[PDB]
Amino acid sequence: MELSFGARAELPRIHPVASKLLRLMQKKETNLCLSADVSLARELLQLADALGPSICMLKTHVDILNDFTLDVMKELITLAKCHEFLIFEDRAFADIGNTVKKQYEGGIFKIASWADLVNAHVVPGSGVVKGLQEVGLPLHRGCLLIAEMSSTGSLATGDYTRAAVRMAEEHSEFVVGFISGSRVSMKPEFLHLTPGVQLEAGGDNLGQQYNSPQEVIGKRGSDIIIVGRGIISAADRLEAAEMYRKAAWEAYLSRLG
Amino acid sequence: MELSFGARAELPRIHPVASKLLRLMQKKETNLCLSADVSLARELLQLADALGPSICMLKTHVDILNDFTLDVMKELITLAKCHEFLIFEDRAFADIGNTVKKQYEGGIFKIASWADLVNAHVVPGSGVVKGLQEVGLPLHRGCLLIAEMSSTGSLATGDYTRAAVRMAEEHSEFVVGFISGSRVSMKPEFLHLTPGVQLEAGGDNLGQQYNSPQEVIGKRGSDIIIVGRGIISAADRLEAAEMYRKAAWEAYLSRLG
Ligand SMILES: O=c1ccn([C@@H]2O[C@H](COP(=O)(O)O)[C@@H](O)[C@H]2O)c(=O)[nH]1
Ligand SMILES: O=c1ccn([C@@H]2O[C@H](COP(=O)(O)O)[C@@H](O)[C@H]2O)c(=O)[nH]1
C-alpha cells in the first residue's frame, strides 16, 4: 500500500512543509539532498545555483561558513525559490527547551528566519521539541528528529530510536520526519532522510560509514539521501549530483513497483 | 579516600586544564560555574567582571549572543585571566567527527580559539571525540562528555550514561569530565559538572528540573554546580552568585569531612 511522493503530499495529516517538499520531489524527479559542506559562501551559492535543479533540499552547517552573513542566506533563499528546493540547517539541537529556542531564533545566525527545516536530537527529552516549536510554529517551519546516526558506535539504536519515533508522532504539528538510516516510522506522513551515502563502499577516518542509494532507499526504505563529499569532493559536482539523483530516484521507483 | 580539589589537581593522570581548574577552585573557594545566558555582550562582560571572583568557570552559549564578535571573546579572556576562571562553551557537539572538527575550529565563532572547555554528546559514537580532539589537542583544550541531562524525559540514562563514562575514560588525553547530575565516574581525575541547580524546588515550563546545591554536590557527589537563571534573573546577581558559591562550597567540604 506504498504511496508515491505526490500522493503522500496530499495525506490528511501531512505537514505543509512536508507537502511542499514531496510535491517538488515528484515534480523534479529528485530525492537527493545536497550536504553543502563548504566553508566559503561563494562556493555554497555556486553549488546551490548549479545543483539546484537536481536536488530537493540543500543542507547547511552555517556554523562552518567562514564568511556567513544574513545576506548570504537571502541569496540562498533566492536560489531555493528559483530552483525549488528546501533549506535544511543541520544544527542538531541538543539542549534543554529554554536554550534551544534561543539558539533557533536568535544569535548571529537567526536560523529560523531562513531555514525551512532544522533537526534535533531526542536525548534531552521532548522539551527540546517544545522549545523549538515555540519559535518554529509561528514561523511555519518544520523539524526532523535524529532517530539513528550513520557513524560508528552510534547510540541512536533500539529504545532510543523508538523514543524518537514516539516523540515525532506526538509533535506532528512541527515534526515532519527523521534523520535515520532506514524507515523508522510506519506512518507515511513522515519523511526519512538518510546521510552516510556514497555509491562506493567505504567510510572516513572519523567514524563515518557509507551505504549506497540502492541500499538506503531500496532496501532500507528511506525517502531521501543526504550526500556531502560524494558530490562536493568530485571534480564535476553537477554530474556527481546527477548520478546520485538518478540512483536515489530509481531505487524509489523500484520500491513503488 | 576522597581527595580535596587541590589534591586532585596533582593526580598522576590529571589533564592540565582540569588541574588548572581544580587549583583555582581550591584557591578561591568556589565550585560555581555561572551559566551566562544573556543575549548582550555588554551584559556578558559586566557579569563576568563582577562575578568573576565568585566563580571557577563561566559557561557560554555564544550562538545566543546577538552581538557576538571575536573581540568580545578577547575581552572575556582578559576577565577570565584577571579573575581566574575558565571559559566553557556549552556547544554540545553532536555530529559526526568530520563535521564537529570544523564546527569547533572554524566558522564565525572560532570556538577553539577562546574556549578552555567544550562539551559533546556521546550519541554519535566516539568519532565525535576523535574529531574534536584533532583540533583541541593541539590547542591544549579539554572536553566534557554529556553523560546525563537535567531535563524531563532525558534519554541519557542507564547504558547510555555508562557508554559516556567508557568514552571519557578511553579519551583521557582530551576528555576531562562530564556534564552529569551525579558522580558517574569513580576515577577522581574526572570533573563532574551539574546543571539544573537552584536553591528552591521547581523547574521551568520547557522541561528543566532543579535540584539544590546540597543535593547535587553533597548527596549526588558532583563537583561543580552550573547555575543560570537562579543567578541571572535575580536583581543582585553578585549576591545571588555568592549564595550559590557558599552553598556548593560547604556541600563539598561536608562531603570531604
Ligand atoms: O547521522 C548523521 C547525521 C548527520 N550527518 C551529516 O551529513 C553529512 C554527511 O556528509 P558526507 O559524509 O556525505 O560528506 C555531514 O554534514 C554530516 O554532518 C551525518 O553524516 N550522519
Ligand atoms: O543537562 C543539561 C545540559 C545543559 N544545560 C544548560 O545549563 C544551563 C541551565 O540554566 P538554568 O536552568 O540554570 O537557567 C542552560 O544554559 C542549559 O542550556 C542544562 O540545563 N541541562
Curated annotation (Swiss-Prot), chains A, B:
Residues forming the catalytic site: D90 (for ompdecase activity), A92 (for ompdecase activity), D95 (for ompdecase activity)
UniProt keyword terms in alphabetical order: Acetylation, Decarboxylase, Disease variant, Glycosyltransferase, Lyase, Multifunctional enzyme, Phosphoprotein, Pyrimidine biosynthesis, Transferase
The UniProt record lists the keyword Iron: no
Binding site for orotidine 5'-phosphate: S35, K59, A92, D95, T99, S150, Q208, Q209, Y210, G228, R229
UniProt entry tagged with the keyword DNA-binding: no
Binding-site positions, UMP: S35, D37, K59, T60, H61, D95, T99, S150, Q208, Q209, Y210, G228, R229
Record-annotated membrane-spanning stretches: none
Reaction(s) catalysed (UniProt annotation): orotidine 5'-phosphate + diphosphate = orotate + 5-phospho-alpha-D-ribose 1-diphosphate; orotidine 5'-phosphate + H(+) = UMP + CO2
Segments for region (OMPdecase): 2-257
EC number: 2.4.2.10, 4.1.1.23
Entry's disease: Orotic aciduria 1: A disorder of pyrimidine metabolism resulting in megaloblastic anemia and orotic acid crystalluria that is frequently associated with some degree of physical and intellectual disability. A minority of cases have additional features, particularly congenital malformations and immune deficiencies.
Family: In the N-terminal section; belongs to the purine/pyrimidine phosphoribosyltransferase family. In the C-terminal section; belongs to the OMP decarboxylase family.
Subunit details: Homodimer; dimerization is required for enzymatic activity.
Descriptive protein name: Uridine 5'-monophosphate synthase
Residues of the full protein shown: 224 to 479 of 480
